[PDB]
């Protein structure tokens, strides 16, 4: 039948726990991340750039997808603990140099055939 085998999160509750200790590791990670990683951004914008990515994926109802994502969350997390990534690697989360993307209909009409 349509019933499926979960890996770690049987339902939303345990999955909601797993996204919580991601915050638990991340929140105490951002301060010394900036400290160790020679970053010039402050902790304040470091904290909420972890925030909005939770709402970047705050629509999935399938527990497996949350579980499939919880592994990657600690993967990028662990990649930051032992300085494996470089400055540009974490800067890629900080969208900083690209041109702003148009939003209103007048802007994309004035830009080109982009729908």
């Amino acid at each position: 039948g349509t019933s499926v085998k979960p890996i770690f999160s049987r339902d939303m509750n345990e999955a909601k726990r797993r996204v919580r200790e991601l915050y638990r590791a991340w929140y105490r990670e951002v301060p010394n991340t900036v400290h160790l990683f020679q970053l010039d951004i402050s902790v304040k914008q470091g904290r909420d750039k972890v925030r909005e990515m939770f709402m970047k994926n705050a629509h999935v109802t399938d527990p497996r997808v949350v579980d499939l994502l919880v592994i990657k969350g600690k993967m990028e997390l662990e990649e930051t603990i032992n300085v494996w990534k470089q400055r540009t690697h974490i800067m890629r989360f900080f969208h900083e140099t690209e041109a702003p993307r148009p939003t209103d209909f007048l802007s994309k009409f004035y830009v080109g055939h982009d729908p």
Binding site: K16, R17, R20, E21, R24, Y27, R28, R47
Partner: protein, 85 residues
Amino acid sequence: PPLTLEAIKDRVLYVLKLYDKIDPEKLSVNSHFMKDLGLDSLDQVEIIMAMEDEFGFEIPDIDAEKLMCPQEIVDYIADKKDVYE
């Protein structure tokens, strides 16, 4: 200097309002964060963080999920490091 229940009252009360989103007007002893303070349970994470670092103890997820009002959190910790006044 042993702490008191009143001491825990002001310890929680102080660190509650350095949270930018927490509004002092909505803040009270009975402040349901998700409706009175308008804070998602995701936001609920970074309060009890400031609890465990300033109180110097550890709050499990199986306990931090229902710690909701400023009254509940006070009586939670009071049983933990054994302050009963």
